[PDB]
Design an enzyme around this catalytic site. Structure first.
Site: not given
Ligand SMILES: *[C@@H]1O[C@H](CO)[C@@H](O[C@@H]2O[C@H](CO)[C@@H](O[C@@H]3O[C@H](CO[C@H]4O[C@H](CO[C@H]5O[C@H](CO)[C@@H](O)[C@H](O)[C@@H]5O[C@H]5O[C@H](CO)[C@@H](O)[C@H](O)[C@@H]5O)[C@@H](O)[C@H](O[C@H]5O[C@H](CO)[C@@H](O)[C@H](O)[C@@H]5O[C@H]5O[C@H](CO)[C@@H](O)[C@H](O)[C@@H]5O)[C@@H]4O)[C@@H](O)[C@H](O[C@H]4O[C@H](CO)[C@@H](O)[C@H](O)[C@@H]4O[C@H]4O[C@H](CO)[C@@H](O)[C@H](O)[C@@H]4O)[C@@H]3O)[C@H](O)[C@H]2NC(C)=O)[C@H](O)[C@H]1NC(C)=O
Ligand SMILES: *[C@@H]1O[C@H](CO)[C@@H](O[C@@H]2O[C@H](CO)[C@@H](O[C@@H]3O[C@H](CO[C@H]4O[C@H](CO[C@H]5O[C@H](CO)[C@@H](O)[C@H](O)[C@@H]5O[C@H]5O[C@H](CO)[C@@H](O)[C@H](O)[C@@H]5O)[C@@H](O)[C@H](O[C@H]5O[C@H](CO)[C@@H](O)[C@H](O)[C@@H]5O[C@H]5O[C@H](CO)[C@@H](O)[C@H](O)[C@@H]5O)[C@@H]4O)[C@@H](O)[C@H](O[C@H]4O[C@H](CO)[C@@H](O)[C@H](O)[C@@H]4O[C@H]4O[C@H](CO)[C@@H](O)[C@H](O)[C@@H]4O)[C@@H]3O)[C@H](O)[C@H]2NC(C)=O)[C@H](O)[C@H]1NC(C)=O
Ligand SMILES: *[C@@H]1O[C@H](CO)[C@@H](O[C@@H]2O[C@H](CO)[C@@H](O[C@@H]3O[C@H](CO[C@H]4O[C@H](CO)[C@@H](O)[C@H](O)[C@@H]4O)[C@@H](O)[C@H](O[C@H]4O[C@H](CO)[C@@H](O)[C@H](O)[C@@H]4O[C@H]4O[C@H](CO)[C@@H](O)[C@H](O)[C@@H]4O[C@H]4O[C@H](CO)[C@@H](O)[C@H](O)[C@@H]4O)[C@@H]3O)[C@H](O)[C@H]2NC(C)=O)[C@H](O)[C@H]1NC(C)=O
Ligand SMILES: *[C@@H]1O[C@H](CO)[C@@H](O[C@@H]2O[C@H](CO)[C@@H](O[C@@H]3O[C@H](CO[C@H]4O[C@H](CO)[C@@H](O)[C@H](O)[C@@H]4O)[C@@H](O)[C@H](O)[C@@H]3O)[C@H](O)[C@H]2NC(C)=O)[C@H](O)[C@H]1NC(C)=O
Ligand code: NAG
Ligand code: NA
Ligand code: NA
Lengths: 832, 834
Positions: A258-260, A262
């Site tokens: 995942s993005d941080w 996200a």
């Protein structure tokens, strides 16, 4: 509202193609793991709890150290004694596969030598839908074929150096505005969910997805899913983009992180294709996770099948073994959160042993050489009325513009580069690195002039026009430096919240150039910027004798530029986007106001594929400088076009590896001190519900699990999948194209021949790039450039067939020096 | 009110010593000239009428080009493709007679090549009475012996290159406040006449006059008299300083020019010993002159004797021939007033032919080399706790301070250097030149680090202390740059009206240094300044490991410094002034308020000779760094002091001569074929009506009462007891004592020692020590050499006001030799000599 249809089950890895050995090794080690050890691989240990911007706990019983994931796409972030490379947009401007590769290699070596296992880059999303998008400069070009090739080369470079590369951000995160709820609130906007990119199936396959098919096919080990929604389903739990597009159709074998911030659900994301949660907590330092404990529980309670977590762990291990990271392993030998030699081992709560956290390892080697070269080979010569190269004999040189000089706070004196002061060599946000130093244009050009015993001065206040005008009247040549900056959304400079509010030069750039050119008949403009800017007020001024765009060159900026200006390097770079007369000419406006009440703003990509040059050509607009335009100190001739026609349906069942026992096997071990805010895989007790702490635990569970999400039986192979980057027959070469290229000028240098096709039909762009190379020729030397067109290169995506099809409309091929200068063209023969 | 006694007549030239040939040639040509031609030689043509900051019309019938006079003491002002040398105060810090000469030679070559005949420098006035005086940096040192020797070597380099040097400002122009009436009015002060320096006769001889005797003796062609008064008589018509001290006592054979706007009378100035009026008008572009037409008339009506005007012309032509200017003559090939290639010949009114005014002649040659070397050799190492030299192996280098960085307006971006932005390499006002470029410390030090593959940054905002402290904590060494500026009075930077308001570092410098030192245990301070600054708040900080003062180094600043920091050059420079704990420790306050109503402010020099280190020693105060202090990367030992006694003039002048003839008023009326350019100053008369041609409201009013007694006396005069030679009676220069000492390099690296010889002249009102001799000697590790010098009769004398002569008093005298004014390990009593 746009809707995202389901695609389940999440495909499992199968040892595809170049993954067979890494896959067999991952299966062999995952088979020995307990459930809490698997879960440790999939989940970060919490924001700023360890050394790296993302970090998992690893599997210590099996000697697998925690995985250290570190920004950026252009050099190590948050560290020391590392290099600062030119941005991705500069690699796009070089049009040079070999330089992309060598930049990848030189970054992999640096990361590897810090104890970093995974590099969070390179980027090809944003592709660049909008010229004012705040992060396009981290990626490559709004052209998918140019981006896809350079993205793949960068990846291979990094991974051949023993670091997992992360193709990001997947997918359609084409603007910073509204990309995160808490961020949007800080800027005064109330939204309940992030911006939804709504895009039709044909457009997504022909434009935004294509550089990711190249990345997958090039063997990228990780993909980072995005903060935005796509058709109102979040990037990091979008079963359609993750399970169908990335994993079933493109056949990706690695792991998705995942993005941080996200990651938005535990069970939902796991079943929709996510493999790794970063930085591991639900919000930074919440001490809570959607996975960790919660994923251990979801498996114990029957909701997430064991085969799905097994598959995460096998993907994550396989990407690690695929680049050989096991043979180069060492804990990260720096801290992202402090430069102190000593500190507490777990930075955020300041707990754990007080010990060495930085070793000051100088991993730069001689990388300043590739950066200087790449900077020179990415400097596009847009205009030259016989003014360049300079000889060194110019009696008095005026260096003009704040963009030539020093950042008075020091090169790293703005956190995450979050200002536009001094020469612009790196834009802002997480896509950054600490400069080891920064050579400004002022420094390198004055040193060059002094070596010839000339007179020279730098004026670096753009409102000091009186002094500019006086010096420019005395000068043999005026070198005027201007810029335009942008960055990731969490930083606002002068009210530009990540995205650019406009495409006009910052810091009085237009007025500076007009003050110089009003007084000096040999005015040369140098632009440093994240993307195109508006030049219409001065580009055609009769005293403006040359214009160059040098992008974001990194630490050797002044030297890369002086090499070009003084003729040590003959510029070969070409523009990787379009320079239009006005912002309106590009269309594709950013969504800047709430348009769906206080719900998620809706970003309809209603232009379809028609972004950058494809949009200008469709509207018959004439750019000032077209995509593919750049001059040289020599000339080239293209002639002699010749064309020649060239001569599994089901998966396995999902496997499980190793065994799952009772809750009591996964309760915190008794001797272990739990660090505050640290995310662990273990349960407080055998009571699942109380150990989850989830207010929704066990409520309506089956109605919240989409149909087919737990189906581990053999699945159909999609018509367009079955390979790496799509069905192998897509890569059959169907047509060979050749041309002769001659250097007809007086200076050795590089040509960038460009091959475009016209696929035909009422909705297709007039021309689309397919092939290119960068070829070095001495004066009078010629070479034959030969290339092939794949089945994919001649196809359109057919939404009815769910496959690439070569349409019956007649196709043409064009070869020349830019998207508008294509003197060679032919009808292509019919092929299928 | 201080009074200045008369001394008349104005002594006439006589071919003294090395002037014999030039005087004979001057006589032969002036003998051929008409009255109006002689007048032309004496009077400038008007502010910005021609090319140079001062310009006469010359004598075109005799093929004598107009004289082009151009600033500054450190390089050609208002021009192009010239160099910018380090200031005179750096020359002092080098303690190097040879570098002083080579600087003067490279400047003279440049001036000559631009078609300039007279350089308006060097400066030994202000000597340096007050550490905050705005122009001390243009000169050398508050010490007369150090200043006099270096002043003289500078003049010889320039004159040997074929250009007339101008020893300025004569005399006692020791502060900028109240120096000019209209200037003071622009700052809100209503004064009817300029500041008056009031000084006793012993003090003037022992201090302020002494470097002017050396200039005269070294053969200086010109002297420029000052804006201030001395005992309430204006510098450019003070018969006592001009007729008596300069021309009769020191025996000066060249010509005296006015400062620009310092000419205050026609008759009174000519009779009191002025020779040339600059820029030629009464106020800039007034199209009136105290001379010109008025001087022609003053001779025609019998008020100024023909012998006086003839003596002016002879002094001006003699100085011109003495340097060989006639063999190098060309019209000035640039304009001070525009950088345009073409313009009107006569700038101010925009008249005369439209033609080439600039030829862009590149006069720099390779002079960057001497500039670079002199900057390095003038960099004083004040403190070094084994921190320097740097090796190149420092892993991360923090360059801290605006004074390391570029001026954002460009190196020349402040008119006459009138700001303190970026690195301070040149102070402000007319003592300036256009840089051809400027190498900053940032540039030179970052290039050095990159050569070694180190890491390096510059932070150049002095209030960006958050970035400063963060970087300093990560650095191997922090190089912190600070400065203090000043300049001529017509420019005010931040409320400093020329003179400095305080001796504190500018632009937050003490807070910058503390913010670095609180954070790097290896903080090195580099100061660029016009003079001393207060270092008491941080010099002894345990993390301040070295401190350097580099002066005003001119165009190679950053390379000069890098040479020293990285050990290519072992610093040999020595402080040419004292670094005190407080401003009060120096005494000698500037006059900053009206203390005489609306009359001329009064500046009494009541400390007498006790300025700079002589005052600290009198008060028993301990400087932080004393006069003569400088460290080296090696060590030196002094031993074997020995003293050896050695074996060591008209009484009337001739009558005043006249050369050539004066005719009727009608010979000197405006020629008819001639277009008079507006504002241009001419020697001619409107008509034979003298009164009406002069346009003077005081014409013929009480004339006899305003002509001092003796003023027209052309008969033979007594030679003063202290006069009769060049820079005073030749017996003053007899050598009486030879001194020798052995100097050894006892360290591991080659370096230069600056042995220093002080005397104690004895007596209750004499400084404990005064410098007399010095040299700078290059020694290899272990090498020794015998340094031998001699004390002259002058060196051992005091000025006796009752005798009007220098006298060796009967108090016992001592010689002291060592490395500074406080580190004198060798002492010897001197035997009686007379
Ligand atoms: C074993 O242990 C496990 C580990 O502990 C236990 O795991 C827990 O199980 C629970 C169920 O028992 C889970 O709780 C439920 O979660 C769901 C899903 O929430 C997430 O996804 C939403 C989008 O869902 C679609 O897409 C995903 C895949 O992306 C699919 O998996 C879904 O099935 C669903 O699929 C449809 O749509 C897609 C297209 O989008 C199609 O392709 C499919 O075909 C389907 O048509 C997403 O919207 C959620 O977002 C919310 O939460 C985020 C914070 O996480 C936040 O950032 C978002 O802004 C948003 O916030 C808002 O909503 C939440 C509540 O979810 C509020 O807290 C918040 O304040 C805001 O309002 C999320 O990412 C969730 O939808 C369920 O909640 C609905 O239903 C309950 C009643 O059952 C209602 O009370 C809720 O209000 C909510 O109601 C909405 O939805 C209804 C339609 O479903 C609708 O009818 C209502 O009108 C209303 O609109 C539950 O929260 C829990 O997540 C999970 N925990 C963990 C750690 O994994 C497990 O239970 C245990 N097993 C056993 C047997 O014991
Ligand atoms: C042939 O042609 C020639 C060319 O045209 C004709 O030349 C003209 O001759 C005139 C006389 O006939 C001249 O006018 C007179 O000038 C004097 C001198 O003024 C200047 O010097 C002053 C200082 O004087 C001393 O020192 C100088 C040398 O430095 C000596 O030469 C003087 O003799 C005098 O010496 C004594 O003192 C020194 C120590 O200082 C001693 O060592 C000596 O032993 C003696 O004791 C100086 O102060 C003057 O400064 C003023 O003017 C400047 C502008 O020029 C200005 O910057 C100053 O601020 C100052 O301004 C104030 O005064 C002026 C007027 O002078 C006002 O206009 C102004 O508004 C201010 O008030 C200058 O630098 C001058 O003193 C005479 O004026 C005095 O006497 C007259 C009447 O006779 C009064 O009307 C005046 O007010 C003034 O009075 C003061 O002094 C008196 C003492 O005498 C006292 O009694 C009063 O109480 C009072 O306070 C005349 O102006 C003219 O300068 C000259 N022109 C040119 C172009 O050269 C010549 O006439 C002709 N021959 C024939 C036969 O026709
Ligand atoms: C998911 O990932 C996370 C994050 O990576 C993993 O969490 C980490 O897991 C590590 C175990 O693999 C755990 O490591 C422990 O660290 C403790 C702190 O070590 C530091 O401080 C000490 C002491 O001053 C220094 O010596 C040391 O060098 C470190 O700086 C250690 O103390 C632990 O050591 C003990 O266990 C190891 C074996 O794991 C032994 O080799 C070592 O000798 C210690 O053994 C004693 O303690 C264990 C029980 O904990 C006993 O079983 C054993 O018999 C010994 O008992 C004696 O001593 C204890 C007191 O010392 C005493 O009470 C008893 O009575 C006996 O006298 C171990 O090295 C990390 O701390 C942990 N990280 C965090 C942030 O929590 C997690 O495991 C992963 N999960 C999965 C499933 O893979
Ligand atoms: C005191 O110095 C004054 C300043 O130097 C002298 O004034 C100058 O005297 C000269 C020489 O006599 C005059 O020269 C004349 O100039 C005119 C104009 O010359 C220009 O124009 C023509 C035609 O287009 C051109 O052909 C020439 O080359 C010039 O470019 C000539 O036509 C005459 O023949 C003669 O050369 C100067 O004009 C004059 N200058 C000023 C500012 O008035 C004065 O002579 C000196 N006095 C004494 C007593 O010596
Ligand atoms: C001399 O003549 C000029 C021209 O007529 C005139 O302007 C000037 O004022 C006169 N000078 C004097 C002192 O009268
Ligand atoms: Na113009
Ligand atoms: Na401290």
């Amino acid at each position: 509202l746009a809707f995202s249809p389901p695609f389940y089950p999440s495909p499992w890895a199968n040892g595809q193609g170049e993954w067979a050995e890494a896959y067999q090794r991952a299966v062999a080690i995952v088979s020995q793991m307990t459930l809490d050890e698997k879960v440790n691989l999939t989940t970060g240990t919490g924001w700023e709890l360890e050394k790296c911007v993302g970090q998992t706990g690893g599997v210590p019983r099996l000697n697998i150290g925690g995985m250290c994931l570190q920004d950026s796409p252009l050099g190590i972030r948050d560290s020391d004694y590392n290099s600062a490379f030119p941005a991705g947009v500069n690699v796009a401007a070089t049009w040079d596969k070999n330089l992309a590769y060598l930049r990848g290699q030189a970054m992999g070596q640096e990361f590897s030598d810090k104890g970093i296992d995974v590099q969070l880059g390179p980027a090809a999303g944003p592709l660049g839908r909008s010229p004012d998008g705040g992060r396009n400069w981290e990626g490559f070009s709004p052209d998918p074929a140019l981006t896809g090739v350079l993205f793949a080369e960068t990846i291979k470079g990094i991974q051949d150096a023993g670091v997992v590369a992360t193709a990001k951000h997947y997918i359609l995160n084409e603007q910073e505005h509204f990309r995160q709820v808490a961020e949007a609130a800080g800027y005064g906007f109330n939204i309940s969910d992030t911006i939804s990119s709504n895009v039709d199936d044909k457009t997504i396959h022909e434009m935004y997805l294509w550089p990711f098919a190249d990345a997958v096919r090039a063997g990228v080990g990780a993909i980072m899913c995005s903060y935005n929604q796509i058709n109102n389903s979040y990037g990091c739990q979008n079963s359609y983009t993750l399970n169908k597009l990335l994993k079933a159709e493109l056949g990706f074998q690695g792991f998705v992180m995942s993005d941080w911030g996200a990651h938005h659900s535990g069970v939902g994301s796991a079943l929709a294709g996510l493999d790794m949660s970063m930085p591991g907590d639900i919000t930074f330092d919440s001490a809570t996770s959607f996975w960790g404990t919660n994923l251990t529980i979801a498996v114990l309670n029957g909701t997430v099948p064991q085969w799905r977590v097994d598959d995460m762990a096998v993907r994550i291990m396989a990407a690690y073994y695929k680049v050989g990271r096991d043979r180069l392993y060492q804990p990260p030998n720096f801290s992202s959160w402090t430069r102190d030699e000593y500190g507490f081992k777990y930075f955020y709560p300041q707990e754990g042993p007080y010990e060495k956290v930085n070793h000051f390892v100088n991993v730069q080697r001689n990388h300043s050489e590739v950066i200087r070269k790449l900077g020179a080979d990415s400097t596009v010569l847009l205009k030259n009325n016989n003014a360049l190269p300079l000889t060194g004999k110019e009696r008095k040189v005026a260096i003009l513009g704040e963009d030539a000089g020093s950042n008075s706070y020091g090169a790293n004196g703005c956190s995450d580069r979050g200002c536009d002061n001094g020469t612009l060599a790196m834009a802002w946000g997480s896509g950054t690195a600490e400069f080891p130093y920064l050579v400004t244009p002022e420094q390198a050009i004055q040193a060059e002039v002094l070596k010839h015993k000339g007179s020279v001065y730098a004026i670096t206040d753009n409102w000091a026009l009186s002094q500019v005008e006086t010096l420019a009247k005395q000068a043999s040549v005026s070198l005027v430096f201007v810029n335009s900056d942008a960055g990731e959304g969490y930083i606002s400079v002068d009210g530009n919240e990540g995205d650019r509010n406009n495409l006009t030069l910052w810091k009085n750039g237009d007025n500076l150039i007009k003050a110089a050119a009003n007084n000096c008949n040999n005015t040369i403009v140098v632009i440093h910027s994240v993307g195109p800017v508006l030049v219409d007020e001065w580009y055609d001024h009769p005293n403006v004798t040359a214009i160059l765009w040098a992008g974001l060159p990194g630490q050797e900026s002044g030297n890369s530029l002086a090499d070009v200006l003084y003729g040590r390097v003959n510029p070969g770079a070409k523009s990787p986007f379009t320079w239009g007369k006005t912002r309106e000419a590009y269309g594709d406006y950013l969504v800047r106001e709430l348009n769906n009440g206080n719900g998620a703003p809706q970003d309809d990509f209603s232009e379809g594929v028609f972004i950058d040059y494809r949009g200008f050509d469709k509207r018959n607009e004439t750019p000032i400088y077209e995509f593919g335009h750049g001059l040289s100190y020599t000339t080239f001739n293209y002639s002699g076009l010749h064309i020649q026609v060239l001569n599994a349906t089901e998966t396995g069942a999902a496997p499980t590896f190793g065994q799952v026992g009772n809750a009591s096997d996964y309760v915190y071990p008794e001797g272990l001190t739990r660090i505050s805010k640290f995310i662990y895989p273990w349960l407080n007790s055998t009571d699942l519900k109380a150990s989850s702490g989830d207010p929704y635990y066990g409520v309506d569970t089956a109605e919240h699990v989409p149909e087919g999400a737990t189906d581990g039986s053999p699945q159909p192979v999609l018509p367009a999948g079955g390979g790496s980057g799509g069905n192998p027959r897509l890569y059959d070469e169907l047509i060979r194209v050749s041309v002769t290229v001659k250097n007809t000028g007086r200076v050795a240098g590089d040509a960038v021949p460009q091959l475009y096709v016209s696929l035909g039909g009422p909705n297709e762009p007039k021309v689309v790039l397919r092939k290119f190379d960068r070829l070095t020729l001495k004066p009078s030397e010629e070479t034959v450039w030969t290339t092939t067109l794949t089945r994919r290169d001649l196809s359109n995506w057919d939404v009815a067939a769910q496959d690439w099809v070569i349409t019956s409309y007649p196709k043409k091929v064009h070869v020349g020096s830019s998207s508008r200068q294509l003197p060679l063209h032919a009808a292509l023969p019919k092929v299928q």
